[PDB]
Structure formats: C-alpha cells, structure tokens
Amino acid sequence: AHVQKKNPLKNKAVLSRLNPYAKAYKANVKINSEKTPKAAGEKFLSVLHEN
C-alpha cells in the first residue's frame, strides 16, 4: 500500500481523494463590489504626514 507518494498540489486526482471539497472552492470572489469606500481618518492622515 502506498508504493509511491503523489503530491496533491500537483496531482489533481490525489487532491480530490484527500479533499472532497476542492471541487467546489471558488477562490476568486468579488468582495470589493459596488463602490470602494475610501476610509482614512483626517487625524490619522495628519499624524502619518507629520514630522
């Protein structure tokens, strides 16, 4: 049993065996949708650009 070690990060079939979840992963997801709310306190900006 297990004559050879197969790397799941390279062997898709072995990864499917180990993880019965990789078939539904969807790594790339729109999370910064709608608009981007620039959030930077004026106090924080002043101290950042201080001295």
Binding site: H2, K5, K6, N7, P8, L9, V14, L18, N19, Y21
Partner: protein
C-alpha cells in the same frame, strides 16, 4: 501550513514515518479527537485547537 502538510506531511504511526496519503491514516491516529481528514488536521494546527 496547508502546503507543508499536503506535500511534506508525514504522520507518526506505530513510531513509523507514514505519509499522509489517505484520510484513514489521520482518522485512525487522531479520530479520538474528532480529526478525521487532512483539512481537519490543518484546521487544528492553523487555529491551534484544544
């Protein structure tokens, strides 16, 4: 953590360096703590469980 356990992950079973090639190996050695698969083992290590 995930790449280490998948690629270089080996379990100590009967004092032997047995590769983590199947979920049954982890279940037979860590099922007492409800760690049934590689992802469960990764979760325990990453989140530092009980």
């Amino acid at each position: 953590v995930r790449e280490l356990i998948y690629k270089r992950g080996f379990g100590k079973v009967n004092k032997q360096r047995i590769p983590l090639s199947d979920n049954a190996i982890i279940e037979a050695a860590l099922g007492k703590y409800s760690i049934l698969s590689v992802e469960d083992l990764i979760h325990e290590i990453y989140t530092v469980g009980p």
